[PDB]
Structure formats: C-alpha cells, structure tokens
Symmetry: C5
Subunit: 202 residues, 5 copies
Amino acid sequence: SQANLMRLKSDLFNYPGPTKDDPLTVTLGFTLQDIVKADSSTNEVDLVYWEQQRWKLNSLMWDPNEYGNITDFRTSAADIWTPDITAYSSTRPVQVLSPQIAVVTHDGSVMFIPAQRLSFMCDPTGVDSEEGATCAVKFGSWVYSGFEIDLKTDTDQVDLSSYYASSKYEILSATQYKHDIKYNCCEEIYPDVVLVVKFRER
Amino acid sequence: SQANLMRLKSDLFNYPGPTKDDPLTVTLGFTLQDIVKADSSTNEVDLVYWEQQRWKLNSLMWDPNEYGNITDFRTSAADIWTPDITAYSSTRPVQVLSPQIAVVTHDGSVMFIPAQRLSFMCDPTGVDSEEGATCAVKFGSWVYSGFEIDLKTDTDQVDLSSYYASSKYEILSATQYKHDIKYNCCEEIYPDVVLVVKFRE
Amino acid sequence: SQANLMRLKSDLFYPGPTKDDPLTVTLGFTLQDIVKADSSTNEVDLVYWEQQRWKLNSLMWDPNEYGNITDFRTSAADIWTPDITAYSSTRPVQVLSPQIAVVTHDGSVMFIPAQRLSFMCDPTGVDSEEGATCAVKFGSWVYSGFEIDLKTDTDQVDLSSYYASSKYEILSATQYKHDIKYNCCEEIYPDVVLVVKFRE
Amino acid sequence: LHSQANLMRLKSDLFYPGPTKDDPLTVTLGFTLQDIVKADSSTNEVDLVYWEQQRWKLNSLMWDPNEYGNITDFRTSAADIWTPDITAYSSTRPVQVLSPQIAVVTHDGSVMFIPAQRLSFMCDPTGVDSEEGATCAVKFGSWVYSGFEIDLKTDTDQVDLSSYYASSKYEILSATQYKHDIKYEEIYPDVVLVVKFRE
Amino acid sequence: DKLHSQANLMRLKSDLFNYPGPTKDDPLTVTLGFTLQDIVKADSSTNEVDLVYWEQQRWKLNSLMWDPNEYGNITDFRTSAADIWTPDITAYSSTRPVQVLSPQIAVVTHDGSVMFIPAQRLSFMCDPTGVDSEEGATCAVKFGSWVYSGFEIDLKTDTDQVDLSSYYASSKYEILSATQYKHDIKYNCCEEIYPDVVLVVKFRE
Ligand SMILES: O=c1cccc2n1C[C@@H]1CNC[C@H]2C1
Ligand SMILES: O=c1cccc2n1C[C@@H]1CNC[C@H]2C1
C-alpha cells in the first residue's frame, strides 16, 4: 500500500494555474475560532480563523483500481498549486498556525484548511455596548480576475461552532457574502468573499 | 566509523506518510518548562515546553552489523517525515527554541523533542487566587484521522520535573490525558492529547 | 489551453537595464490606511498598494501562436522586478499580498504588492484642523535615471480604497515625480515622492 | 539588444575566497546618519537608521569595456559575490536591512555596496534631555579578519549628516567616524561611530 | 604573491569541501566559553531576562586537516559556518528563539581545529527579584548539545570564569559574579548522560 501511494504521487507529480479558457472554481468558507484582541489606538483587530479552500483539477484525478484502492492522500501544500486568496485589509502579514498540508481525492478535488491569525482594519468603537462593533474584511484572489478564478461559498454564514467560549469578545453575527468589484488598475471584475463580523465585549 | 555512518545515511535516504492500510502510532508527551505569561487583556497564555514525539518506520531499520555496529544516529528533521501534531487553539505560530534534529535508532524508531514557546487561548481569571486558573489545549494531527495516525502516551501526567522554580506562576496540576473521539457523522475516530494546566500566581 | 500556457512559459523561461537599454518604470500608489502615528519616535505606519508597470521585448509573444492566450500570471521570482525602495523607511517593509505579477502578450508587466511601511514622519499637528504633513520618497536603490526612467501616470494618489474608519482621515495625498542632479555629472536620480496631509 | 547580450556575456565570464595575510584587502567604510529613531533609558538601547557605504576592489572583477560594448559597470545581487563581514560590535538586536541587497561593480574591479540599516546598540541616553545632550558610541569592524587581512579605511572622519531627518525627535550635535587600532602580532582596526545628540 | 595565495586558498577549500557528526566510536570534544557583553533588560512581570553574549565554540576534526606546505603555507582560513558542521549547543531555558548578532563565519586551522564565536541576544527564564538590592539577583542558564549525549559530544571549558572584560560599562545592570561550570545530567527521555555548561550570573541595578 505504501509502495502504491508513492507510485501514485510520483505519477501525479511527474498546473500552470487557471486561464480564461480553463477557469477554476474555488469554494471558500470561514470558521472563526476567536477574536484575540482589538486595538482602539490603531483600529486593528486580531482574529484566529480556519480558511477552508476547495477546488478540483482534472490533472489530479486517478482510478483507485489502478492504485490499490487509494481514495485520497495527504500532501504538502507546496507540492501543488494553491489559490492566492488574500485578505484585502490586513495590516500585518497573515500568520499561519497549522501545517500546510492538503487533502487530494481521486476525483481531483483538493481541500486545504490553513489556520491563521490576522490583523485587519477594524474600528472597535461600540464594542463595550450591547449593540457591539461591526467590521468587515474582504477575501479574494489578489491577481486572478473573475474570468480565471470563479469564487464561491457553500453557505452565507460563518461557522461559529468552534468559537472560543471564553474569548474576550462574543460574536453577535458573522456572515460571508460574495461580491463582485472592479478595480482601477484593471478592467476585469474581481470576485471576493466578505466576512462581516458583529462582536462585543463578553 | 564516520564512513560507515555516511554510507548508512546515504542508503537510508536513497516515506509518504501513513495510510489506513499502513497506520502509524505516535507517542506524545510534554515536559513543561515554564508558564511565561498570562494576558487577561487578550485571554492568551504563553507556555514553554518540550514536546517529545516518538514513532517507528520499517523504512528506517538497519542491521548494526552491516554498518560498523552503529545503533543510532542524529539527523536533521528535514531529512525525514515528521508527524503533523498541532496545537488546536494556538493564537500565534509556535516558536521553536531548539535544534530541529531527530534521533533515529536501528529498529526504525525516531525520537524528536522540539522545545517550543506557545501562545494559546486561555482565560486566566482566578490566577491571582488560591484555586488558581485552569486552561487546556488539544494536540493532534491536523489532517490525519486515527485510522492513519494513532496517538499514545507513556503517561497522563505532564513532566513537571524541570518546571522553572522561580516562574511567575506555580503549577497546581498538569495532565496530558488522551481522548479518542468519534463524531456522530462519521466512522473515523479522532484522537487527541489534551494539555490541562492549573496554575496560580 | 493549459498545455499552451505551459509551452509559452517554457519558451519565455533579463539582466536588468543599462545606460544603452534604459527601462521605463511607472509607479502609482493606492493608499489603504494610515495605521498609526507615533509621536514618541516620529514614525508613521502606512498600508498601501504599490502599482509597478514596465515592459520587456523578451516577454512578448503572438497570442495566435499560443491558443489566443493574451496574458498570464507568474511568481515575481520568475522575472526581473525593479528595486523600488522607500528612502526613509525605519523598519523593513512588510509584504501583505502574494508576490505574483501579470504579464501581457505585448511584453508589459504589472505588479502590485501590498505593503505596510514605517517611515520617518513628525505627526505634530495631526490633532488640529490643519493636520500633519509627511513625505517619503520612492525610487531605485542602485539605478540612476539612465537605467530606470521612473515615471508616474498621475500625481493623484488613489484614495478609493482608503479605510473609511481609520484613526486618520486624508486631507490630501499626492505623488510627485522628482529628481536630483549633480552639476558635475550628467546622471539624474529620479524618485516618486508621496506627500500625505492627514489628521485625527 | 547588443547591450543586453554584452551584459549577459560579461556576467557569465566573471561568474573570491576572501582575503589572506598574503592578499590583504582594503575596505573603505563611511556612514550617512539618516535618523535617530529612539532612545530607551529603561534598557540603555538607542535605535539608529544609517546607510553604510562599503567599497573594495578585486582583480577578479576587472574587465575591458572595449570587449563588452563599453559596459563600464553593472548591478548584481550581493549574494552573487563576496562581501566584507563588517559588523557592529555593540548591537543588541540583529541589524535590520532596509534596502535591496544589490552591489555596483565597476570595470576597474571595484565594488560599492550601500545597505541601509536600522540598528539597536548599547547606549546610555542620560543627558539627552539637556543642553549638553547624550553621547554614545558603537564600533564597526570585521568579525573574523585582522588588519593584516582586511585593511579598514575611511574617506573622512565626519559622518555624513546631509540627509539627517530634519524633524527627528533628536537633533545631532556631532557625529564622527574616527579610526582606531587595537593591539593585543596582528593589529585590529575599527571605525567607531560617535554620536552626540539631544531631544 | 597575492594571486598565488588566492589560488592556493581556493584549491585548499575545494579539496576540503570536495562530516556526518560525532559517533560513539568517534566522539568529539567541544570546548565552550562565554563572554558577557551586557544584560539588556529584566522583566519582573514575566521573569525573563535578556542577555547579549558571545559564545566561543572550539572543536577539532581530522577531515579538516591539511599541510601548509601543500597549499602555499596557509595556516588557517575563514569560511561561512554553513560550509561546515557545527555543534548544536542550545540554551536550555530560553523563552524566545535566540537571535544572532554577528556574521556566521568560522576560523579553520591546519590542524583541523575550528573556532566559531557567534554573538547572540537571549531571553531566558530568570526571576530578577532583589536586583534593586545590594545582594542583587542570581540566575542560571544551562547550555549544551540538544541531541548528542556525553558519549558523542564531550563538553569542556577552558576556565570557570565568564569573560567580563567586554561588559558594557553603562549597562543598567552591573555584574557581581559570573561563572561557567560543567555538569552531567540524566534526562527522562534517554538512558545516556548529557553534559552541559551552566552560566550562573549574579547582577544588580
Ligand atoms: O496585483 C494585482 C493583479 C491584478 C489585479 C489586482 N492586483 C492587486 C489588487 C487586488 N486585486 C485586484 C487588483 C488590485
Ligand atoms: O532532543 C533530544 C534528543 C536527545 C536527548 C535530549 N533531547 C532534548 C532534551 C535536551 N537534551 C537532552 C535530552 C532532552
């Protein structure tokens, strides 16, 4: 079985990114673990979250019958192409908290779920009130337009089922709606997923 | 002997990770050096510990008689596969405080003991009291279920034998119980080792 | 299509400019936010996007020879990129976006890294109606105007993404094309000067 | 086109194990002090921003411009070449580089490298809030080479203050870069930056 | 003469570089000494203290031996620490990753001895209580190989005294005493004994 897995990986590794004629659908979903801190002197808020990314490539397909019934495998994210999904309003480089390892399945679908800590632009005024503070952060491909990476979601709600119950901040709502925007630099429209979080001091 | 060691290393390096058909047992244990800080403005606590990891691979076996009676060697952890054991509630990238070097023994067993500083989600309310504060952080594989990586411990007690005697925080209790969790949704069993620390000023 | 793109990239894969092959580099700033202003050290921190454009003959192709591919994306480390540097930073610049460029069939490259910069700036007056004014120059570290001809498309900094709830509001943001020369020597050193007037 | 081809050819033709007692290298140092960012009296650390000019010359980097289309100099990554190990003796944090790591090589074989850096070094800022000010010093020299191997020179005793930030928290009263030798048979040279400054 | 010396050095380096670590049958002696430059700060809110020091490391390998006559009488040379094996001497009680302050360059001598002296800033567990009193505070920090036992790396000192001759005269903290003593310790993880050099510093404001 180990020999079969090594052979399968060797065959697969022995993708130039999407194109307008071969666009890629990337599904995005956010799980918000915690709101670590809010800095009212700089309007920066720190969040810990899991960013679930899923896409499918014909080049990553295989027949499990030809490889000892291997249905899927784990591999370093550096072994494959991954989408350049970026927070648009970070104020510090995003910090990764989990192994960079993807799960590839025989139908060519890949699931990547890195855990990260992000500092982003957010005014926490009103967090010390019952109505709380509201902030947003956009996520999208930095360089690929809607014609190359089509960006989708499975749900309009951020997954709060793992939110740290003793966080300094409690979540009032958290949504993840898709938006289409045009930037001054380029004519083509760029899709994005915007996380809108309403939160308050616990 | 030096030539024998280089030959052994060359032969060994000239593993794809575990599978359901070829699963791997990883033994985990913690030595808690110190609780550096507790931050009640963010509910983050910072620990320094040694994370001892042990596992064993047939592909790393050899006969000492074939290599000058060498029974073990040291090698960079980048030369070998290592398990993806991760703290599930960290708030900052773990900081490595020791060389990334493993010890490999002729029976194929590997011993890795990185020293790290970890910031994790923890409410320190009560740390300034007699009963102290309590916090917990789960360790496990990020991508492997128990059908691929099985977790074991040699003991459910954290090694406190070198805990810093003049730390700002004294340890009331520290355990590393192992839990096998089966979700209602799926057949696979997920195992974790949970560090539970009770401490006070 | 994917095979055509791979063949094009292999075919394509520049020593940098010289006095006899000068390269025009166009610079433009999008100012996202003024994160902080530290009156104890006179340092101000900005987040901005630095749009860089240039064009190389060695990056041209005919889309008809490559399945009508007119552009592609590639890692910035696959290609030469200009050494544009803030001249009064006080900390290493921190990169906030993927280091990926857009190459177009006419040989033009577009690269827009997002960065956080700490630079020398006295914010005195930021708590008044007139606000504070600070400036920072951007330009090549090692190339004179004979090798890298630095240009702007406009002097108006793009404020369309400026963070509306920043601690600081922008009174004006201007990007000037400026150069310094020595009478003794022919060489001219150009820079783009970012001047920001802002207040609490 | 011809210039690009010639540059590529020149770089290939050219692509040094460092100096020795029998092949000593002159390294010329100069400082431009851009700013004194901060002074921390709780730890006696001061933070400076400066440009450190380094120049040296190697026979192995010479060429005839006539053979390469009148190319008289070129730019190259500092990792493509040997660089002197000049270091600050009293730094309290790793020096942070603020500029591209790129050097200029000229056809006579001389190399010029001017990294911009932010440095935290040991310094008692006592007096900085007075008319007389504070005075601090930091020595620069090779970590591993003696004066028999790296002959450390300057073009001037004066730190270049023509770019000092006019609105710094700290104004400069004087800034010198005098040379010093220490004998313990080798002689060990340094260049000492001495800054006298005040709020 | 300069051309010949350069050629000789290049040839020597090429021959030398064209070591898998010590073994029980081929143990390595590593000599350690410390120079304490400054005690940058004491944090009583976390019991962390920050030190700047130089760590002098010396060892000797047969594979780095050469004849000076063979290569223009070249007694020694400088080379990047990345070109050679170096020992994994680690601070046992750091609270932050150690920060390197100097070039990583070693001096290799024709008898195969290496000398490597990185300058580092270290944050280590240390309670500074009493630093504001005449007796001062006292802290220790163990150094040793992380992974090689006494049977593979034998750890020695040249002296019991930490070199204070470069200590920063205007530090916030003055040194009352500083010693470096060797100890042999048994750890729970392994049967074999592991040696260490412990730095014991008494200091005050
Ligand atoms: O670098 C590129 C490359 C292509 C397009 C863009 N940029 C970066 C910004 C964020 N994404 C949309 C737009 C502006
Ligand atoms: O990683 C190893 C490998 C071998 C032995 C040890 N460890 C690390 C700790 C520090 N050194 C002694 C002991 C415990």
